[PDB]
Amino acid sequence: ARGCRLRSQLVPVRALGLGHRSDELVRFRFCSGSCRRARSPHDLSLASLLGAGALRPPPGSRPVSQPCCRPTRYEAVSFMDVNSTWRTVDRLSATACGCLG
Amino acid sequence: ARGCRLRSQLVPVRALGLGHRSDELVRFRFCSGSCRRARSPHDLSLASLLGAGALRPPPGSRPVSQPCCRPTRYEAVSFMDVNSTWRTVDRLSATACGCLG
């Protein structure tokens, strides 16, 4: 369950950051989880260096020592707005995940 | 400086987690930094949902909501071990970065 995989949850369209206020619930899918199984020699050494405190913190976010769990395919989310007009946002919801990079 | 880019530092071979203990340092390069401007519509909605606490937490790590800063190219690293034998690991060090999302 902690490993990289497709996740999903019903959420209101208004929470999607699309500028709409509809309370209609739509199933939003996304990717999250560990990708340690797909780590390369570079990744393992980076992980070891960080674990040993051998690396000085570069400016900004910490280096990721493994591929990131990201969508490999997407599908559109559609809904009716306040005027009963159909709206569609293409490729907004994930349909598959992978350990990329 | 906080944006995704190639980083570099001299590090002890012993800290690379290779099992081989050397005594010289090697130049190790990696990638780290932000990719916010590279967010896709999916990433933006995921970020909107996470920002509002609209998603229950999936087991393990939180989903990433922007491409990850990862290497796009690598190079070998070689070093002489404590018994005077040269060792090498292909593609151990990064030579270029990209916002892989």
Residues ≥6 apart with Cβ < 8 Å to A17: B44, B45, B47, B48, B49
CA pseudo-torsion sign A35, A40, A44, A50: negative
With b for 16 or more beta-carbon neighbours within 10 A and e for fewer, the A57-93 pattern comes to: ebebbebbbbbbbbbeebeebebeeeeeeeeebeebb
From A11, A56, A91, residue closest to B42, measured CB to CB = A91
Residue A86: strand pairing partners:
A80
Q: According to DSSP H, which parts of chain A are helical?
A: 41-52
What single DSSP character describes residue B45? H
With b for 16 or more beta-carbon neighbours within 10 A and e for fewer, the B9-30 pattern comes to: eebbbbbbbbebebeeebebbb
Residues A57 and A11: their CA atoms lie apart, in Å, by 37
A15: alpha, beta or left, given left = phi > 0 and alpha = psi -120 to 50?
alpha
Residues B3 and B22: their CA atoms lie apart, in Å, by 33
- Among residues 48-87 of chain A, which lie with CB inside 8 Å of chain B? 48-49, 52, 54-56, 58-64, 67-71, 74
> What is the torsion angle, in degrees rounded to the nearest 10, for the CA atoms of residue B44, residue B46, residue B52 and residue B57?
-160
Residues A68 and B1: their CA atoms lie apart, in Å, by 22
Residues A24 and A64: their CA atoms lie apart, in Å, by 36
B84 in Cβ contact with B20 (< 8 Å): no
Q: Residue B64: helix, strand or coil by DSSP?
A: coil
3-state DSSP: chain B helix, strand, coil percent, rounded to 5?
20, 50, 35
Q: Which of A11, A45, A95 to mutate to test the interface with B (most CBs of B within 10 A)?
A: A45
Contact criterion met (CB < 8 Å) for A42 and B100: no
Q: Residue A51: helix, strand or coil by DSSP?
A: helix
Residue B22: strand pairing partners:
B81
Both tokens of A29, joined, read: 């899918």
Contacts of A67 in chain B (CB under 8 A): 68, 70
Amino acid, single-letter form, for residue B28 = F
Domain boundaries, chain A: 1-101
Both tokens of B2, joined, read: 């906080």
Element (H, E) at B1: none
Both tokens of A25, joined, read: 């619930």
Element (H, E) at B48: helix B41-51
3-state DSSP: chain A helix, strand, coil percent, rounded to 5?
20, 45, 35
Contact criterion met (CB < 8 Å) for A48 and B17: yes
Could you tell me which of A89, A22, A71, A42 has the C-alpha nearest to residue B100? Answer: A71
Rounded to a whole number of angstroms, the distance from the CA of A60 to the nearest CA of chain B is 4
What single DSSP character describes residue B58? P
- CA neighbours within 13 Å on the CB side: how many for B9? 18
Could you tell me which of B83, B65, B69, B86 has the C-alpha nearest to residue B34? Answer: B69
Mapping DSSP onto H, E and C, the string for A53-81 reads: CCCCCCCCCCCCCCCEEEEEEEEEEEEEC
Q: Which of B46, B79, B90, B91 to mutate to test the interface with A (most CBs of A within 10 A)?
A: B46
Q: What CATH topology corresponds to B1-101?
A: Cystine Knot Cytokines, subunit B (2.10.90)
Contacts of B47 in chain A (CB under 8 A): 17
